[PDB]
Amino acid sequence: VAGQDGSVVQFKIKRHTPLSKLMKAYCERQMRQIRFRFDGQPTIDVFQQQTGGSKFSNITIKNFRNFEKVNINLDNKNVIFGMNDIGKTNFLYALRFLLDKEIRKFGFNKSDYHKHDTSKKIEIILTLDLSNYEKDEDTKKLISVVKGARTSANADVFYIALESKYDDKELYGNIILKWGSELDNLIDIPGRGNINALDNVFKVIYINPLVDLDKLFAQNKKYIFEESQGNESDEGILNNIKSLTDQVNQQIGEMTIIKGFQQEITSEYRSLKKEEVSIELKSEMAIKGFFSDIIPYIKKDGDSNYYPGDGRRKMLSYSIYNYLAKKKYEDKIVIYLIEEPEISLHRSMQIALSKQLFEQSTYKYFFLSTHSPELLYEMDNTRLIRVHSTEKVVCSSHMYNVEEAYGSVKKKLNKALSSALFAERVLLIEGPSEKILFEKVLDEVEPEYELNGGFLLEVGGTYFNHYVCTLNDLGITHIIKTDNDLKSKKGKKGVYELLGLNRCLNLLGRENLDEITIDIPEDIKGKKKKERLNERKKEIFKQYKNEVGEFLGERIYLSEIDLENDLYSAIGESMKRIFENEDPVHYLQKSKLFNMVELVNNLSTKDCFDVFEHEKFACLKELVGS
Amino acid sequence: LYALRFLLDKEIRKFGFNKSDYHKHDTSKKIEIILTLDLSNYEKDEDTKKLISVVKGARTSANADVFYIALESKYDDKELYGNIILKWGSELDNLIDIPGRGNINALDNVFKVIYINPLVDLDKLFAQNKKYIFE
Amino acid sequence: SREQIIKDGGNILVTAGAGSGKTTILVSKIEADLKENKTHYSIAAVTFTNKAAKEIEGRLGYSSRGNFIGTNDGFVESEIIRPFIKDAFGNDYPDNFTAEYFDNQFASYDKGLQVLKYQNILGTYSNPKKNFKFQLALDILKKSLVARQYIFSKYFKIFIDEYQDSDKDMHNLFMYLKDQLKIKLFIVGDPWRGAEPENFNGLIENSTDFNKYHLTSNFPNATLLKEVIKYVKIYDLAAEIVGNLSSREIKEIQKIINELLNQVLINQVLINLFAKLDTREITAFTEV
């Protein structure tokens, strides 16, 4: 059973057993308010009644193209990504079929059924939350249209279902929309002619990367200028312009060359057919008015010229979308389906679009399908949906949030994590020194590990909880290679906290161990102090060997002392030879960045394979996938 | 020909009416396309029985001879859309909406409009029908 | 005047005289509010006379906003009773009943309520002073949560005319829609079978929240005999009759009316016509 706030509880399952006892146990740990749902039907998700959450709870897709049976949790802002490109495209289409009138009116072909098996029926069910009825105005928009399809018992939940059974006689699949608070019985959505009640409440705006700007301004220019009021000065100017355009047409007819042509072509037409007509050359705008051909112009400041820059036009096309979003639709719920915005978009503009999607409130509800990590640089309070590489189309969903503790490092944290989302196996390392060594070792051993799905994500100064929880929920394999560290508390002497051990324990869900005290003489300094700490680290590692065994099961590899000591065990003679020093480990730790580069330069292929095959560096084998 | 397609062809009707489809582009005026049918030869004509079976209770015994199929559309200035609503019945003054589920309505079961255009690829034509022709 | 009443958006008392400004103010105020409000909310206009409902609707014209224009009894049936009867009272109660008020009268609420379930038809009350339909609608709103949610989410202002003719039960429901459901009210009262003049007159003196506005004049049963007289010289006269009138009752009324078309037979048809729902009035009918 998975909680709404990310809490996970484990329970024992018994055969031929009602679920009521499990429901009672969960309620006692935390009944009428809560609702229990399994795979979109009433791990088990829970519904905590009046909470601050999205209207959209989850969507179920059955027998639609790729999706044999898929249930995906949702939120206001949803990002879908993954290797399965057809799965991502079909997911967006399933939303369009449910909510977009233009897509729905075409019906379902034979290809739209799973495995082209028209015997099975297509079902697309969207579950909504109406608990925050008074806080949310969009909930009131839906309730007003729905009217009596709801029940007071189930006033918090609502379903919008799409059903389609193929007609072999007519070679046609008819889409029938139903809705209601009870999933077992749903009434048909009322409608007259082409439109139904659902089209009044839901507006789907499909943003495609290849959108002509002037085309976009063409349709919306009508609303933008009729919605606003017109004072006396505007009316006088409007009439004055009409006079000016009329004079332009009159002056055109006064030219000798134009008058000569239209007289000649009139005689030519009269000879063709004896009809009492005349031909005039008039300006098209002056006939239709200035409104017909008005278009936006990018004007550089200090420059008189008007320019019809492609990138400038691409970005401003979103400004119109932002402008309309503020005031175009105040009477309906607007859902934006943004598909591959990064196509032919500079990475700096991708970050700009990322800030609009997540930081701003312009796009309250959207589904974003992306292939570029840059669009996720500002991601926050969004639901991440990952389509697995398998052809079976499995979808893993995680509700991404950044806590207040991570608020100061949110920018750095998001930039690193965004690239890891597009990977199969992620190895969590500490700093660049680990990255330098592992990149060299992997280069000599498995040079195309990045192609296969490997990724080296470096995290420093923070607990692994944020990264692991996101990666685990999305179905991405995570490997943690950390080292046993002792951190001294500020203002207190001789006492250290097992920072390295605590981070791994926090991953397991256990509480942090208490700080331990280490007694050293004042004379003991430098190398003598360091080796004393190493002795304590070795003792602590032995003492908690049971926990270390648990870490290995969870793909957490904790070094006994640090990476350098583990590296020395794997290649001692080689490291000692090239470092030409009595104690290579101490020298390597003096300047970690520069000495590691020097060590990596002098490493041979045999040494790299020795590191790869060593027991301590088992994380490399896990990352490779062997 | 388009007025006939809008009334009887599902594929044309599903697109609705643009602003250009209204006379003089005058959105205020409503579009009406009414087809009057004769059902007097009920027993002689099998196609009359095809229509009567679908129509069911929309008829009246007083007007059992005449039937009307009406297309009505009023432009929506807010949505920039002209919705097409089909009505039918034996009495012209009061016509009930043609019942339907989803995209199809009762009228699409009885009437089939085959639009023969002057240019048509033969194999393109044979591709559709070869399914039915042999199954 | 009219300008100040347009600007005000709260509860407004209109006290127009002679009935000249009723429809004119209503249509103007509705148009101003609809054009000003860009949200999803809509308005509901309720009129005692069905004729006033269509004549009002004509002036607003076609609109997809979802506004409701109709009779007072048609409002509760279409918006409150029919959709939410089952939710408030269980699935046993029906929602396909077509209300009529010329048959199956009820003695009391504890008698009218349960007989409603079996008959599958809505019956009026033998006592004009109390209206069973509106207290039932009020009861549904109190019992059903979704009904309360729908009303709040659908309508932001209610337009009511001829509030001097409003029943006490009707006033009770409209007050309920105002105070706990936080819905703006626009009532109109000129200084119906069970008309209660107390509620409208008492509203002006007691309700401090309401704003009283007076519209200048220039800017009883006989009226129910004019349309039948010109009809002699059937749906049009039903539109003048207060409330939604069932077609079944039309067939019974029409045979009485066509019987009129000597003096003696003129008198007795008006006797039963008045019974179904003046000494000088019958003489006036004899003259015409």
Q: In three state form, how does the secondary structure of A273-308 look?
A: CCCCCCCCCCCHHHHHCHHHHCCCCECCCCCCCCEC
Burial of A143 (0-12, 13-18, 19+ CB in 10 A): buried
C133–chain A nearest CA distance, Å:
19
The CA-based angle C50-C52-C55, given to 5 degrees, is 115
| CA count, 13 A, side-chain hemisphere, B62 | 3
Q: Give the span between the Cα atoms of C170 and A206, in whole angstroms.
A: 48
Chain C residues with CB under 8 Å of a chain A CB are: 38-42, 64, 66, 82-84, 87-88, 144-147, 149-150, 152-154
**DSSP class of A512:** P
Tokens for A403, please give them: 């806590």
A507 neighbors A522 (Cβ within 8 angstroms): no
Measured N-to-C along each axis, helices C132-143 and C82-89 cross at an angle, to the nearest 10 degrees, of 60
How many Cβ atoms sit within 10 Å of the Cβ of residue A414?
20
Helical axes A347-358 vs A310-327, angle rounded to 10°: 10
Residues of C with CB under 8 A from a CB of B: 62, 64-65
Deposited experimental method: cryo-EM
Q: Quick check: helix, strand or coil at residue A511?
A: coil
CA-nearest of B27, B15, A331, B87 to C62 is: B27
Nearest CA to A73 out of A135, A6, A146, A24 is that of A6
Helix (H) or strand (E) holding A420: helix A410-420
Please tell me if residue A456 touches chain C, with a CB cutoff of 8 Å. Answer: no
CA distance C157 to C160: 10
* Side-by-side strand order, sheet with A56-64: A67-73, A56-64, A122-129, A157-164, A176-180, A187-188
**Amino acid letter for position A516:** I
Q: Which residue of C has its CA nearest to B81?
A: C64
CB contact under 8 A, A193 and B83: yes
Instruction: State whether residue A301 sits within 8 Å of chain C by CB.
Output: no
* A contact residues 129-158, partner C, Cβ 8 Å cutoff: 133, 137, 139-141, 143-144, 146-148, 150-152, 155
Who's near A272: CB < 8 A, 6+ residues apart? none
**Angle at alpha carbon of residue C151, lines to C145 and C157, rounded to 5°:** 150
Kindly list the residues from chain A whose CB atom is less than 8 angstroms away from the CB atom of residue B101.
174, 176, 188
Q: Quick one: A32 exposed, middle or buried, by C-beta within 10 A (0-12, 13-18, 19+)?
A: exposed
Cα A77 to Cα A82: distance, rounded to the nearest angstrom: 17
Phi, psi values for residue A320, rounded to 5°: -60, -45
Contacts of C150 in chain A (CB under 8 A): 143-144, 146-148, 150
Joined tokens for residue C277: 């729902």
Tokens of A508: 């397991």
**B neighbours by CB contacts (3+ pairs under 8 Å):** A, C
Contacts of A226 (CB under 8 A, 6+ apart): none
Burial (CB count <10 Å: 0-12, 13-18, 19+), residue A394: middle
- Phi, psi (5° rounding) for residue C166? -70, 135
In chain C, the residue whose alpha carbon lies closest to the alpha carbon of B30 is C62
**Distance from C-alpha of C162 to C-alpha of C196, rounded to nearest angstrom:** 11
Those of residues 564-583 in A touching chain B at CB distance below 8 A are none
Q: Are strands A556-559 and A477-483 parallel, antiparallel or unpaired?
A: parallel
Cβ count near A473 (within 10 Å): 18
At residue C232, the 3 state secondary structure works out as helix
Q: Which positions in chain A touch B15 (Cβ < 8 Å)?
A: 105
- Are A200 and A142 in contact by the 8 Å Cβ rule? The answer is no
Give every CB contact of residue A221 below 8 A, 6+ residues apart in sequence: A291, A294
* Cβ–Cβ < 8 Å for A147, C150: yes
Which residues of A does the annotation place in the binding site for a divalent metal cation?
430, 434, 514-515, 564
Among B14, B86, B102, the residue with its CB nearest the CB of A176 is: B102
Closest CA to C122 of C154, C94, C147: C94
Token pair listed for A362 = 């312009």
Q: What share of chain A is helix, strand, coil (3-state, %, to 5)?
A: 45, 20, 35
Cα gap A340→A349, rounded to integer Å: 13
- Strand residues in chain B grouped as ranges (E): 31-38, 66-76, 81-89, 96-97, 100-101, 104-105
Chain C nearest-CA distance from A164, in A, is: 27
What residues have CB less than 8 Å from A65, skipping those under 6 apart?
A86, A90, A93, A111, A112, A113, A114
Residues in chain C with CB shorter than 8 Å from the CB of B79 are 64
